[model samples]
Target: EVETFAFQAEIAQLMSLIINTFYSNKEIFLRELISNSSDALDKIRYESLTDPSKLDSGKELHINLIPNKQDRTLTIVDTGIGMTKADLINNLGTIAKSGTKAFMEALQAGADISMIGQFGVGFYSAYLVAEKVTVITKHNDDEQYAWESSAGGSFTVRTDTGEPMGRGTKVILHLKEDQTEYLEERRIKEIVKKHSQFIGYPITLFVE
Candidate 1:
């Protein structure tokens, strides 16, 4: 089944602000996304301590980056705690409504806050360099689903039956015309080295 929802007023404003105002370093989008994946990995690891079945995949937790020049997209895949359909709408839709409101207030006040994970708005930063963002996630307790948006007034979520996926999330950023730089291996490696070099889980990049 497929459903669509409009972004909360605050979230819609935030997306416009993020895309128009946050322009100092566009590459930070990669950093923010990678950090999110790291957080997911940590959550699963902590949860598995009490419920070992959560790690039934038996595969080591890790993040993989795949840049496709042909498709002009950069995919970040993680073997971590994935989100359920509700989680997607709640987490990515309303986007911690109160938190987002606070973020907007802070931004307007020129507060120099760390943008990563603050107010759970980092995910929207993909708009900085991406024309669209697609997240395919599967939680052990839920069916696979796809969440997609273009930083527009609304987004869509639907059951996905393309390729079988394990318990984790895969985020694909469809790069903007001028943001094709992110589709280069060297650029991705440099960004990872600079910001996420010390991340707990292994972050591997696929190479042909």
Candidate 2:
């Protein structure tokens, strides 16, 4: 059943705290999102090593950045290991919730910015700029699904009726009122070159 399962309080609280602390470097959220995409690609590549047919036959792994000025959205997609319902529930944040106290303690003790992604809460950094994030994913063993969240407090997941992705994940970020800069291709290119260019997979931006 695609239903409502709220993010745990610890996660909400910890993320809010992280948001406040990282307010100055909000652009870093893009870096984290791209990093996550890269990790997803790496995961599928690793899996394919054990079973040659793990990935769709002959499909090259790639990451795409799609900017929509009309919709005021920026979508980051990766041809990689998509997620299942259970994978969404566990990896989305709750698994990281268990380490919140420890993560926060280090922060209180003045930990470096690098610690943010270490706890797997980097995905929540989307809240730094976006008002909403919709994740569309297709797993080899499961049907397509969509997970939507405001990143402010709660999120919801359900079966997706859109055409299947074949394989991989797509994350669409709806920019906030003052965050429209993300919808510009130039800014996105700068970020990708500076932060994501070193990632193994090919990263392409859809031009207007």
lDDT of 2 by residue, 78-144 (tens): 8888888788877552367756767777778987555677766678778778878899988787888
| C-alpha lDDT of candidate 2 relative to the true structure | 0.80
What 10-residue stretch in candidate 2 is worst by lDDT? 90-99
Candidate 2 deviant stretches above 4 angstroms:
18-22, 112-114
Q: Could you report the Cα RMSD, in angstroms, for every candidate shown? A: 1.8, 2.1
Residue-level error in angstroms, candidate 1, position 127: 0.6
> Which ranges in model 1 have alpha carbons more than 4 Å from their true place?
93-95, 112-116
**Positional deviation of residue 72's Cα in model 1 after best superposition, in angstroms:** 0.6
Which candidate gets the maximum TM-score versus the true structure? Answer: 1
